[PDB]
Amino acid sequence: ALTVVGDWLGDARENDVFEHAGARDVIRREDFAKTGATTMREVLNRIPGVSAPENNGTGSHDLAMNFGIRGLNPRLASRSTVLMDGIPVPFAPYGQPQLSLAPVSLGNMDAIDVVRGGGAVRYGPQSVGGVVNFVTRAIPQDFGIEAGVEGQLSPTSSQNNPKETHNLMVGGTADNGFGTALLYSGTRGSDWREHSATRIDDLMLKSKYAPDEVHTFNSLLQYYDGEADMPGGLSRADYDADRWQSTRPYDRFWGRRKLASLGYQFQPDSQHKFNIQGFYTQTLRSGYLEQGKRITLSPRNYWVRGIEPRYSQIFMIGPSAHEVGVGYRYLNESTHEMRYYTATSSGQLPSGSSPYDRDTRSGTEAHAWYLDDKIDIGNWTITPGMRFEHIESYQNNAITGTHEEVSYNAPLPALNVLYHLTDSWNLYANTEGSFGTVQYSQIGKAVQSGNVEPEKARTWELGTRYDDGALTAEMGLFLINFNNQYDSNQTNDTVTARGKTRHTGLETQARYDLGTLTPTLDNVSIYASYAYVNAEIREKGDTYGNLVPFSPKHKGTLGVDYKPGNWTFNLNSDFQSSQFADNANTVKESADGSTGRIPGFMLWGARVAYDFGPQMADLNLAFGVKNIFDQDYFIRSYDDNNKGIYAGQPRTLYMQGSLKF
């Protein structure tokens, strides 16, 4: 019959994932709770090839997001394209993609779509680490209400405040076709570290209007507001004395985000689909930070506006089917950063009336177009594609009086192939171009060195996906060569130095219904995920041949789910090998705990849950434990002011409860 797929990202349709010509994994809301995940990182870590470290460094709190794909720097998740319903998550997607503030909450999501490969044509910038899309909860067809909550506590920690997460969903669609849903997610509390008190409020208003089967309008309004004290790292001496404490009393973070998104879809028939999405985000992220003999306050304001028209249509050319997709996005961002200060020796935090030694304004105007053709011929599905981006960014320093500008392009050609061995078995291969922008913080270096070219990456993937129903499995290999990185891999960064890293490995995961063997194991499912990742520094210099910091060569999960009747029993293990903290790959630990080998570890967790049924409105209850054996482990922050050792999550107890009307 030929139906146009169009947006394969969207709400992560099971079919689009299975047919995805490249590494892609989706964890749906239904599976979030099995490990007591309440944050993005916890679900993200369950995906092979993804590393989302515990809070640390500048992102030493829950409002930030830390994750790296395939050994890419996880600090503030700046190496992947982060989106929510296809909308840019960063307050400065291009100029400063560091998610010191990440206005997204797991509670408002129906799924987390991690597209490690095959997404560099339609999504960007910072596409080297693929695309990570947070799919928000779908609007119910007929009015329904859903509420859930999870509380956590680390008994062995000195930190007695629990961490509490709340989510509320109220929605439904009317006969006239107007649908709407209020999505609320909230976090209150502290984790296992002292000085981690957190408040997050994520309110979204989602609307859909389908007055017929051709016109469809959708809107997303969001108000995200949060604040959090930042634990920071400890020196080895302080860590040995008490690993829960914080020696960074002034470090605090807060930010808010206002988001308005408006979309329209025109689909006259099943062969043509037009979509136009518009959005505007206002962001304020500020924080107190102890820096040497001074305490600083860094208010940073961002404004982002974008409009993205897209069009898709399927047709035939001989025996092969062709689905052409074209898109364009105009994105504009404006920023204002200031740093107020006071002497740490003084007895006060900086304020708007304190002196300031930084007053800069930055902005970017980015134009991006993409074209791809999905060709179905026989058991094949070949999709060549190209993305091109023209970016203009500037940074005006009101104190030095300087104005810096950079203008550059990013041509990203791609090719992905899918082969259907059987109705339940696919093979894929692909290669694509991805890039990293010249960040505002790097413009000074960029213009001074005399080179303004973007950070370029070329990726290669080979894989397979299987699903006979009782068994789903996948395995893929990947190769990434990331060059011209403004952040060098040398111990001493110079204006001319440029980072270069190679990322190779294998990613695999499987799930098997042990029941399809012996009824003795009915409702028993076993699963595992594993990724071998070799991220190496290929930048000529003092660190050539060293391993990229914060990249475990081995990382994965294994678990078993047992669901007899209305019960659910989950057992899971998380493991990863050692990692380095600095480009020098210093084995010996520094006294300040900021550098030195970081041990690998294997954690175990379990959970018991019960679903009560239709009457007292699908009440679901669960109790679980993270890090059952209280395996001690830690991570380090190397370069930030609150660098040092960060105790890993100790044994943690949690409870979950949800209601559906």
JSON list of C-alpha atoms in Angstrom, two decimals, residues 37 49 137 159 210 214 230 281 350 357 567 590 655:
[
{"chain": "A", "resi": 37, "resn": "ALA", "atom": "CA", "xyz": [15.34, 4.64, 38.07]},
{"chain": "A", "resi": 49, "resn": "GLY", "atom": "CA", "xyz": [27.48, 2.11, 24.83]},
{"chain": "A", "resi": 137, "resn": "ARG", "atom": "CA", "xyz": [4.04, 11.07, 27.83]},
{"chain": "A", "resi": 159, "resn": "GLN", "atom": "CA", "xyz": [22.90, 12.04, 54.66]},
{"chain": "A", "resi": 210, "resn": "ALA", "atom": "CA", "xyz": [-6.94, 16.68, 15.17]},
{"chain": "A", "resi": 214, "resn": "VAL", "atom": "CA", "xyz": [-5.51, 15.41, 7.73]},
{"chain": "A", "resi": 230, "resn": "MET", "atom": "CA", "xyz": [26.46, 20.75, 44.91]},
{"chain": "A", "resi": 281, "resn": "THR", "atom": "CA", "xyz": [13.00, 28.63, 25.12]},
{"chain": "A", "resi": 350, "resn": "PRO", "atom": "CA", "xyz": [28.24, 37.36, 45.83]},
{"chain": "A", "resi": 357, "resn": "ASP", "atom": "CA", "xyz": [34.86, 40.44, 36.50]},
{"chain": "A", "resi": 567, "resn": "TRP", "atom": "CA", "xyz": [3.94, -10.15, 40.96]},
{"chain": "A", "resi": 590, "resn": "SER", "atom": "CA", "xyz": [46.77, 12.75, 43.68]},
{"chain": "A", "resi": 655, "resn": "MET", "atom": "CA", "xyz": [9.84, 2.39, 47.26]}
]
